Amino acid sequence: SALNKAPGYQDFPAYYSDSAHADDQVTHPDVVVLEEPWNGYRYWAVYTPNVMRISIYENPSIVASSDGVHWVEPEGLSNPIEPQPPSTRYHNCDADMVYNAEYDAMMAYWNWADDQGGGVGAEVRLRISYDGVHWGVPVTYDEMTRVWSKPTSDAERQVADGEDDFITAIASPDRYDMLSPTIVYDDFRDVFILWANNTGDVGYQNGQANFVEMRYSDDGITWGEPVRVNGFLGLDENGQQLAPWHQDVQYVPDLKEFVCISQCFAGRNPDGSVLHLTTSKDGVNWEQVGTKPLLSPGPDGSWDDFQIYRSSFYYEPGSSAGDGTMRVWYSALQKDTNNKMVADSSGNLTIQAKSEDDRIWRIGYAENSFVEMMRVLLDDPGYTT
Ligand SMILES: C[C@@H]1O[C@@H](O[C@@H]2[C@@H](O[C@H]3O[C@H](CO)[C@H](O)[C@H](O)[C@H]3O)[C@@H](O)[C@@H](CO)O[C@H]2O)[C@@H](O)[C@H](O)[C@@H]1O
Ligand SMILES: [Ca+2]
Ligand SMILES: [Ca+2]
Ligand SMILES: [Ca+2]
Ligand SMILES: [Ca+2]
Numbered sequence: 001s002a003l004n005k006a007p008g009y010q011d012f013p014a015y016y017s018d019s020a021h022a023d024d025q026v027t028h029p030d031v032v033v034l035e036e037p038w039n040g041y042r043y044w045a046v047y048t049p050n051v052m053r054i055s056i057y058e059n060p061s062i063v064a065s066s067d068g069v070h071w072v073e074p075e076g077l078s079n080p081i082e083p084q085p086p087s088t089r090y091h092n093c094d095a096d097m098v099y100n101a102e103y104d105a106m107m108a109y110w111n112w113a114d115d116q117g118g119g120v121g122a123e124v125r126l127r128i129s130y131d132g133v134h135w136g137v138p139v140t141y142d143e144m145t146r147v148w149s150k151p152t153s154d155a156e157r158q159v160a161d162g163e164d165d166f167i168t169a170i171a172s173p174d175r176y177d178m179l180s181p182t183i184v185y186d187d188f189r190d191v192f193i194l195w196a197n198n199t200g201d202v203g204y205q206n207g208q209a210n211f212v213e214m215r216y217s218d219d220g221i222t223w224g225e226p227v228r229v230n231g232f233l234g235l236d237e238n239g240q241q242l243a244p245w246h247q248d249v250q251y252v253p254d255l256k257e258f259v260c261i262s263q264c265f266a267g268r269n270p271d272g273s274v275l276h277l278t279t280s281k282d283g284v285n286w287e288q289v290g291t292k293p294l295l296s297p298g299p300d301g302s303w304d305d306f307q308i309y310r311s312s313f314y315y316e317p318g319s320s321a322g323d324g325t326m327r328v329w330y331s332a333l334q335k336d337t338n339n340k341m342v343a344d345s346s347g348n349l350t351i352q353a354k355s356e357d358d359r360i361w362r363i364g365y366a367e368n369s370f371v372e373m374m375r376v377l378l379d380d381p382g383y384t385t
Contacts, residue, residue, distance in 0.1 A: 002277075002294045002368065002376040003328055008347035009303055009364035010329070012071055014049035015079050016057040020356035022342070025051050027331040027361045028180075030096040030248065032106065033068070033314040038099070039132035043068045045312075045329070046095040046108045049080075052358040055091035059084055060110045064132060068327065069365070074132045081127055081135040082110065083163045089116050094180045094310075096248070098192075100220065103150060105130050105138075105157075107220055109183060109194075113175050117201075124170040124181050124194070126221065128159060136161030146222050169194075170215070170223055176203040180246035180310060183220065184258065186283065187251070192217040193283055195229065195260075197244045207268045208243045214283060232278055234288035236266050242288070245270040246310035249283075254317045254324055255370075255385070258283050261294065261328065263310050272297065273307040275330070277377060290377035295330060295366060303343050303362055304332030315370065322385030326373050328366045333359045 059080030063071035213226035
């Protein structure tokens with residue numbers, strides 16, 4: 001196996017309470033792993049609750065951990081960090097978070113859509129935090145200039161964190177052309193990079209017409225014009241082209257390259273999607289690693305038996321160069337779940353799925369040696385970095 005899935009899944013809290021849906025359904029994690037603790041913890045994650053049929057609960061939420069396994073809501077934090085929309089016309093999705101070393105602050109991005117055709121389109125929005133508890137607009141950010149000035153005291157390391165306290169990073173008049181934004185700070189060129197999937201004004205059924213675009217920014221706040229990446233995905237084991245749905249990118253210093261885990265598909269839409277691995281020296285020009293999937297749905301009846309959904313990763317360096325560990329927080333869905341018993345996070349059959357749970361959404365974990373992963377992907381038992 002390219003990655004070894006951990007048994008069960010991880011417990012993430014979801015704020016919602018809805019009688020027609022099992023609690024604590026969640027997707028699309030984005031994890032930040034640090035060398036040293038930030039506001040008490042070395043692991044920070046943003047994620048969104050989600051259920052079938054209604055997207056209104058899909059609101060950026062934060063947890064922290066000391067281990068990447070057991071997640072807690074920091075003391076004083078109220079999830080979601082971005083409020084529930086006022087109606088089902090609108091929904092949030094697709095969170096991704098970066099640690100900004102210069103400001104010693106987290107930058108949490110997400111996608112907001114007006115889903116009404118002929119509506120206003122969509123936006124990539126941003127809330128920043130200094131303390132891990134309050135997420136919003138820095139008090140030394142000037143909305144007129146869009147400049148985030150570095151704090152010059154502890155008192156300036158504060159945010160406004162009300163319901164309207166976000167930054168619009170990007171706007172588009174189409175609804176679905178900036179899906180799954182993923183941000184990396186390139187410390188060579190000294191620029192923020194954001195990759196997103198362009199599904200036009202169509203979305204989930206756009207399919208093989210999907211393509212990824214990148215944008216550049218000096219600060220992470222104001223972004224330039226998009227340009228298409230090249231070579232993002234390749235052929236699968238049948239020789240069939242893969243198309244993007246959702247993705248996470250990392251710059252990996254130990255590998256001297258950008259690495260991306262892509263939730264992708266060979267058919268008409270992301271049903272049954274798998275993960276593939278793709279890499280790039282520059283962020284622009286990519287090549288898929290092997291023909292084989294990095295992660296696939298589990299067997300019938302498993303919590304991940306429908307599709308693998310958007311996943312986040314960290315390359316943990318080893319003691320030797322080029323010999324690290326791939327750590328993957330993967331989201332997934334189970335099919336055919338209405339009124340059925342489903343697994344808890346320990347893998348025990350203790351949860352009753354509810355009447356409108358057509359599927360169940362959870363976040364779990366998988367891991368492998370980077371070298372062993374590459375050996376499986378490339379069908380090369382002797383690969384070494
Ligand atoms: C309930 C329904 O939910 C959303 O549509 C889902 C769709 O959601 C994904 O794709 C749309 C674009 O088509 C957005 O990017 C979402 O952030 C994605 O999660 C898929 O799940 C398809 C699967 O068949 O089902 C649609 O109903 C939302 O766009 C709708 O407005 C509505 O809220
Ligand atoms: Ca999404
Ligand atoms: Ca990320
Ligand atoms: Ca091209
Ligand atoms: Ca190609």
